[PDB]
Amino acid sequence: MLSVDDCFGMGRSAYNEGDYYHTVLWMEQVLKQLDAGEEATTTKSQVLDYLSYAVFQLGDLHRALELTRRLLSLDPSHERAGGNLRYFEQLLEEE
């Protein structure tokens, strides 16, 4: 009985406290519901923005990259996606 937008608010709250582990769980739930077709004012792009960053803070560069690429595909002029993609691709070369 939490709406899509309620779950996004929960994940944003957790993110603002630096709780990236629970940010991921909340944002994955939001994204699941959006990808299933449910209505909301929150956009897929907004979710992928927080999700990719929290995943990165947890240390998963490959998943942060994949999420950032999806974010950019849906939001080419996004404030952060393009710059994060460049940075993440750099970190990939340290492998």
Binding site: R12, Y15, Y50, Y53, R80, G83, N84, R86, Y87
Partner: peptide
């Protein structure tokens, strides 16, 4: 360039 700032509050 450095990475963008983190997502806002």
């Amino acid at each position: 360039p450095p990475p963008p700032p983190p997502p806002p509050p």
